[PDB]
Amino acid sequence: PRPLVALLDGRDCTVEMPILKDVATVAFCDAQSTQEIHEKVLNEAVGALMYHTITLTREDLEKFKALRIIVRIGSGFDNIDIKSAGDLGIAVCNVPAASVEETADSTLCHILNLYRRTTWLHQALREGTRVQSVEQIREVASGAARIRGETLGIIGLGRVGQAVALRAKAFGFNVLFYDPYLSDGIERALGLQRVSTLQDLLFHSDCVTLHCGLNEHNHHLINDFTVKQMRQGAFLVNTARGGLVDEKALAQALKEGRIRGAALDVHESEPFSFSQGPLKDAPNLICTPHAAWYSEQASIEMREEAAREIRRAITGRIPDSLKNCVNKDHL
């Protein structure tokens, strides 16, 4: 009578429920792993709501008997094999932009915490660092640089990337971006400098920030080789996808000093920990629990959206009844 929809990696349906209360049987598995999923869920689940803390390979998808649509609560669908998925007959959707602002703001924040060193200043005082004379101030703050004039290198001028550029120009930054798959002319409309190769950007940048969607071509975009293409004491800010940066190469660069600092909200291995991993002992390093997207408003907003998508399906028709599908051309 009423199809079944399961919240794979989670156990809170308070928001989605009011929208699927009469068109589905919402339940939760809270399966941090692809195998921790309940049997009957893998058997009788017309739809599925999932976040990011769980990936789905073809090997996994082929286990879902009744699955026909997967809704990713967020703008990132790299943890899902949208292709193998599509070819299997299961539609995959995403929430285009519900936390673009949240991330843009949080991004500029990490950038400021590097240039202004406000995060380390606090931490320093929190440990008994006594600062008396202006002499000491220049010491504890030794590193704080002026932003006026500095060139902000942006890799990926998407929803988030663009928001960052608007805020970037406000601080006097000399913004310039790189986006191969982006249409020509957009730079003019936004009044921004556009390079044609990653090599050019890293060469003309004092601070590089990642805002590109992870895929098969940009994996490990930042590696020992591309790092050599960067400038000395250049800053790095990654609030996109952990696979974009080679934690080992960065950990090495940070230590050698070829990179004056780094801010990371996303990491290769999540959850992240300053104890395990290449960045185990990396200098000048700021990290956040992949929460740049968080906001009580943005959270509910994206969840209510995904909830609608699930209903546009159970009620409408796949895929012509889906507003935000990512494989409408793969099946």
Partner: peptide, 7 residues
Amino acid sequence: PIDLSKK
């Protein structure tokens, strides 16, 4: 609202 968590 259904607890489909593997026990």
